[PDB]
Amino acid sequence: RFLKVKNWETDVVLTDTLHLKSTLETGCTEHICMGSIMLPSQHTVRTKDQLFPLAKEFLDQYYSSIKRFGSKAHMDRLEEVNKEIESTSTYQLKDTELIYGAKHAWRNASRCVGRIQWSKLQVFDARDCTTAHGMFNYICNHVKYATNKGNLRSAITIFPQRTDGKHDFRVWNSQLIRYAGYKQPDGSTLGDPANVQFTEICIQQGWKAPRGRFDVLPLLLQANGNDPELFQIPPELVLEVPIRHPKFDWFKDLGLKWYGLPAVSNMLLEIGGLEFSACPFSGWYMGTEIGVRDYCDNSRYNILEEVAKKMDLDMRKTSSLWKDQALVEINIAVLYSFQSDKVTIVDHHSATESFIKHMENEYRCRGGCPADWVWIVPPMSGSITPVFHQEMLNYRLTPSFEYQPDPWNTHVWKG
Amino acid sequence: RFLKVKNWETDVVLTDTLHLKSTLETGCTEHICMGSIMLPSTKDQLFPLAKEFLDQYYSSIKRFGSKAHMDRLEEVNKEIESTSTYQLKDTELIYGAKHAWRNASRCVGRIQWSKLQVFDARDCTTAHGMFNYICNHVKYATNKGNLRSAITIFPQRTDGKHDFRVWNSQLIRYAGYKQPDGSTLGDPANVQFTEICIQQGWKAPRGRFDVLPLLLQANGNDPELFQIPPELVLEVPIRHPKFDWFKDLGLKWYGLPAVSNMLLEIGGLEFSACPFSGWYMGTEIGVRDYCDNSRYNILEEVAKKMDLDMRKTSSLWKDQALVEINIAVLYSFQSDKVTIVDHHSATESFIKHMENEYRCRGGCPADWVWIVPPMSGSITPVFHQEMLNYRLTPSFEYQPDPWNTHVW
Numbered sequence: 106r107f108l109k110v111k112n113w114e115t116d117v118v119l120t121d122t123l124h125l126k127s128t129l130e131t132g133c134t135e136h137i138c139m140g141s142i143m144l145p146s147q148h149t150v151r152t153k154d155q156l157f158p159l160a161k162e163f164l165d166q167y168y169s170s171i172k173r174f175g176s177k178a179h180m181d182r183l184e185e186v187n188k189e190i191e192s193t194s195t196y197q198l199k200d201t202e203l204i205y206g207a208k209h210a211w212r213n214a215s216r217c218v219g220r221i222q223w224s225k226l227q228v229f230d231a232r233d234c235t236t237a238h239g240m241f242n243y244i245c246n247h248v249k250y251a252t253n254k255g256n257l258r259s260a261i262t263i264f265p266q267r268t269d270g271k272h273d274f275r276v277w278n279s280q281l282i283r284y285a286g287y288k289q290p291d292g293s294t295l296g297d298p299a300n301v302q303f304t305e306i307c308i309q310q311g312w313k314a315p316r317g318r319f320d321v322l323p324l325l326l327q328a329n330g331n332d333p334e335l336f337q338i339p340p341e342l343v344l345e346v347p348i349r350h351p352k353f354d355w356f357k358d359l360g361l362k363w364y365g366l367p368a369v370s371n372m373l374l375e376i377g378g379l380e381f382s383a384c385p386f387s388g389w390y391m392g393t394e395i396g397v398r399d400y401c402d403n404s405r406y407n408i409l410e411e412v413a414k415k416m417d418l419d420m421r422k423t424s425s426l427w428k429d430q431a432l433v434e435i436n437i438a439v440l441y442s443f444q445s446d447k448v449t450i451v452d453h454h455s456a457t458e459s460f461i462k463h464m465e466n467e468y469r470c471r472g473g474c475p476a477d478w479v480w481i482v483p484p485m486s487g488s489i490t491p492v493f494h495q496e497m498l499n500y501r502l503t504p505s506f507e508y509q510p511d512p513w514n515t516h517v518w519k520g
Numbered sequence: 521r522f523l524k525v526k527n528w529e530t531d532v533v534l535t536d537t538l539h540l541k542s543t544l545e546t547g548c549t550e551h552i553c554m555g556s557i558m559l560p561s562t563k564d565q566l567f568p569l570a571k572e573f574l575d576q577y578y579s580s581i582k583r584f585g586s587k588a589h590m591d592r593l594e595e596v597n598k599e600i601e602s603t604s605t606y607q608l609k610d611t612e613l614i615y616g617a618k619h620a621w622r623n624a625s626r627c628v629g630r631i632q633w634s635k636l637q638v639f640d641a642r643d644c645t646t647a648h649g650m651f652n653y654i655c656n657h658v659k660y661a662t663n664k665g666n667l668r669s670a671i672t673i674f675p676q677r678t679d680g681k682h683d684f685r686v687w688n689s690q691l692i693r694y695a696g697y698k699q700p701d702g703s704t705l706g707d708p709a710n711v712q713f714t715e716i717c718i719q720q721g722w723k724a725p726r727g728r729f730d731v732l733p734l735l736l737q738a739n740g741n742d743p744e745l746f747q748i749p750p751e752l753v754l755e756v757p758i759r760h761p762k763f764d765w766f767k768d769l770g771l772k773w774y775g776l777p778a779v780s781n782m783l784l785e786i787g788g789l790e791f792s793a794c795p796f797s798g799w800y801m802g803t804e805i806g807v808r809d810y811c812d813n814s815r816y817n818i819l820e821e822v823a824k825k826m827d828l829d830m831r832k833t834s835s836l837w838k839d840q841a842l843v844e845i846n847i848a849v850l851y852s853f854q855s856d857k858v859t860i861v862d863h864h865s866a867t868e869s870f871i872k873h874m875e876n877e878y879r880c881r882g883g884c885p886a887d888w889v890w891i892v893p894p895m896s897g898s899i900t901p902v903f904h905q906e907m908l909n910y911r912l913t914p915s916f917e918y919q920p921d922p923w924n925t926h927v928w
């Protein structure tokens with residue numbers, strides 16, 4: 106059964122057959138659409154029972170992609186995985202399989218607008234890691250390689266898979282590089298309000314907080330199920346960009362800066378039924394992630410009103426669109442600062458344009474591209490980007506990146 | 521299965537039980553979400569539909585299972601039996617129309633749902649009669665710029681051969697013409713309809729802002745052209761509160777959004793002609809009607825006049841122009857005392873409406889893909905609001921364009 110999507114701005118129609126290969130559930134039914142739920146339970150322990158069917162499905166996938174489906178290499182590997190499961194209750198991916206699986210988890214990430222780049226992912230195999238110090242070293246190297254002095258390169262570092270769920274590797278940080286947030290007694294917040302809870306855990310674990318507005322948080326790394334340990338990223342590894350505006354000289358005076366490398370570190374990579382609970386991945390920013398969300402979200406730095414004041418806008422009534430007007434300027438300043446400093450960034454027009462090209466190519470060479478419109482459309486100027494008028498089909502393919510509960514809610518403390 | 525929606529800006533959690541009363545289907549399955557698909561897809565089935573409607577009607581008036589309810593149920597049951605259809609009482613007609621708007625999950629303006637003015641036009645027999653009812657609707661709803669919400673309901677479908685239809689997609693829309701040098705004058709969204717009207721006997725002035733004639737179909741006959749009296753068409757000249765050169769662009773828009781091509785379903789009955797109107801959200805003109813590439817596409821001209829660097833997208837010249845255009849649209853309407861709401865006020869109103877509906881009704885079906893405005897989405901409160909989308913009845917539905925289905 107085929108399904109079609111129409112771009113209503115160009116009348117281009119595409120035919121999705123890939124959705125038949127879908128296994129996991131969406132959360133929707135015939136009578137309710139959960140398309141705007143941030144985490145369907147579906148999007149968030151496993152025995153030898155249900156494991157070999159998942160392994161077989163992944164290996165069939167993998168050997169098809171190398172055009173060796175049904176070969177002796179394919180059938181022998183199936184048997185080898187079978188015996189390793191029945192005797193060890195898990196199994197180990199070859200290097201080739203791990204690289205393929207990680208690239209395809211990104212290719213499958215239906216909320217990621219940056220997926221045109223999915224095949225150019227540098228995969229770092231950290232499955233020989235055993236300790237938190239070992240994790241810190243792998244992460245430092247990831248940060249150095251990814252940053253590349255501003256010429257950002259996508260990368261992922263994969264720590265050992267889950268076994269009995271009692272020996273998990275976890276990065277307790279939500280991203281490798283994030284700014285601390287401090288709740289003051291007067292109710293205000295210093296730094297990034299998005300990180301107040303994690304900052305407090307860090308301070309509790311012994312971190313001496315500078316209590317500044319842009320303190321890079323320490324790494325809180327959990328190896329093999331042990332209590333997590335604190336490490337400071339060497340500051341020369343943290344590339345940062347002072348935010349200025351090309352016409353507004355007072356903009357520098359807001360004291361703002363941001364870090365160059367977005368490296369998400371709290372998601373779970375699933376490949377052939379194996380669960381990689383620690384797998385930080387990084388690329389480069391779309392400007393709106395910093396300029397719209399990171400600075401202008403009401404629950405974030407919320408510099409909108411200050412920028413509004415310094416522009417001397419009518420802040421009395423909302424219908425003056427002072428918020429809209431200040432948001433654009435803040436996003437101009439983010440792009441201008443990164444480009445001036447030669448730090449890789451992409452604006453939301455370029456990125457959505459690339460994504461449509463990626464999506465059309467995926468429909469032709471792959472039969473489909475799962476896409477989450479609610480997440481693909483940029484958080485400003487939605488309808489003047491090409492993805493707004495693009496119909497999209499959302500479904501869940503494996504390998505996948507999944508959400509998982511924050512470790513501090515599930516961790517059994519050693520003391 | 522008593523579902524919960526969370527607002528990630530406020531942490532407010534709402535519990536939705538209203539979805540369990542949902543009947544129609546969304547187009548999604550457990551294996552695929554079609555939440556961004558624009559248009560997903562008689563005798564036997566009529567009495568259950570009527571029962572369901574009358575059950576909810578008599579519940580709303582706190583007389584479920586009373587003398588009146590059971591009597592009306594059999595009365596309708598008898599009429600369907602013989603006549604093969606049935607006729608709504610005035611009271612049920614008004615209830616069904618207010619609740620078809622209440623249930624329109626893509627409508628951000630539903631906090632106003634209970635103040636709808638319903639015009640019963642079920643006695644109309646001709647396109648001329650339809651034109652009379654529509655002029656009265658337009659005059660009432662315009663109200664000299666103090667716009668009022670309104671719906672006019674023409675006779676319900678019978679055999680599909682006697683359909684009442686308004687062929688326009690809105691009562692008031694600007695013409696669009698194909699030009700020699702390839703492009704388009706007027707309004708590109710209306711090029712096919714503008715040529716149908718010409719293909720009917722309309723002498724087009726061939727300007728930018730030519731108000732289209734009405735093309736009215738009664739009882740299934742060929743449609744007829746009618747000119748809306750210009751004194752009934754309120755227009756706003758578009759100028760900018762800071763940029764004096766903006767008036768030089770020669771733009772205007774009409775005050776009354778009156779959508780006329782949808783179908784109103786109440787208790788199984790199908791009202792194929794049911795023009796309804798309210799007032800504009802600024803972005804419906806300034807973002808979509810002016811800046812969409814498939815529309816007026818004046819963005820590049822605005823940013824040019826603003827002397828913005830249009831050589832790279834990363835200057836955000838489009839975004840900068842888009843905001844100025846929408847500031848002007850709001851400034852122009854407000855200066856002329858024509859009702860209009862900005863996207864910040866309307867979305868804030870919609871969160872309050874959602875609050876209300878969960879508290880007094882158990883839920884509110886809401887289509888996030890359509891509720892979030894087409895600009896500045898994440899700084900409006902609906903962006904961070906989880907929503908549940910489901911189809912309740914009475915409802916407004918899509919229907920094919922008549923010129924694809926009418927036997928001439």
Ligand code: HEM
Nearest residue numbers: 211214215216217218219222259386387388389390391506
């Ligand atoms: C290289 C440039 C990249 C860009 C510009 C980009 C952009 C984005 C954006 C804007 C989002 C939406 C998140 C939000 O707005 O809060 C997103 C989601 C996401 N990105 Fe990408 N990303 C990039 C690279 C990558 C890489 C290298 C990976 C993994 C290896 C990745 C995996 C994801 C995932 C898993 C999500 C969430 C998807 C889901 O939950 O289905 N991205 N990305």
Ligand code: HEM
Nearest residue numbers: 621624625626627628629669670796797798799800801916
């Ligand atoms: C009075 C102020 C109103 C405002 C500000 C408003 C706003 C909107 C907006 C912005 C949309 C999205 C359409 C688009 O962006 O292209 C919409 C959709 C819609 N509106 Fe409203 N509206 C109002 C009144 C009404 C009334 C009076 C009715 C009917 C009685 C109505 C019925 C609908 C319907 C049926 C849809 C499409 C829903 C669907 O397809 O499921 N609206 N509205």
Ligand SMILES: Cc1cc(N)nc2cc(-c3ccc(OC(C)C)c(CN)c3)ccc12
Nearest residue numbers: 216219367368369386387388389390391394
């Ligand atoms: C590699 C990469 C680059 C980039 N430029 N951006 C990225 C954004 C996410 C991301 C961000 C936010 C988010 O949502 C949280 C608010 C829960 C999720 C969840 N799927 C993923 C993940 C990876 C990204």
Ligand SMILES: Cc1cc(N)nc2cc(-c3ccc(OC(C)C)c(CN)c3)ccc12
Nearest residue numbers: 626629777778779796797798799800801804
């Ligand atoms: C009374 C009213 C007021 C308003 N201020 N705005 C309105 C917008 C629509 C509307 C607009 C577009 C649309 O869909 C097209 C893209 C085909 C639909 C159908 N869902 C309804 C319908 C009624 C509206």
Ligand SMILES: C[C@H](O)[C@H](O)[C@H]1CNc2nc(N)[nH]c(=O)c2N1
Nearest residue numbers: 493494495496556557558889890
């Ligand atoms: C592809 C997408 O479904 C289509 O462009 C929709 C998206 N959301 C929308 N939202 C509103 N309010 N109005 C629209 O016309 C649309 N168009």
Ligand SMILES: C[C@H](O)[C@H](O)[C@H]1CNc2nc(N)[nH]c(=O)c2N1
Nearest residue numbers: 141142143479480903904905906
């Ligand atoms: C409620 C809603 O689903 C939630 O706020 C989502 C909406 N879409 C988003 N889209 C992107 N790109 N990033 C986000 O964080 C969100 N948040």
Ligand SMILES: [Zn+2]
Nearest residue numbers: 133138548553
């Ligand atoms: Zn859905």
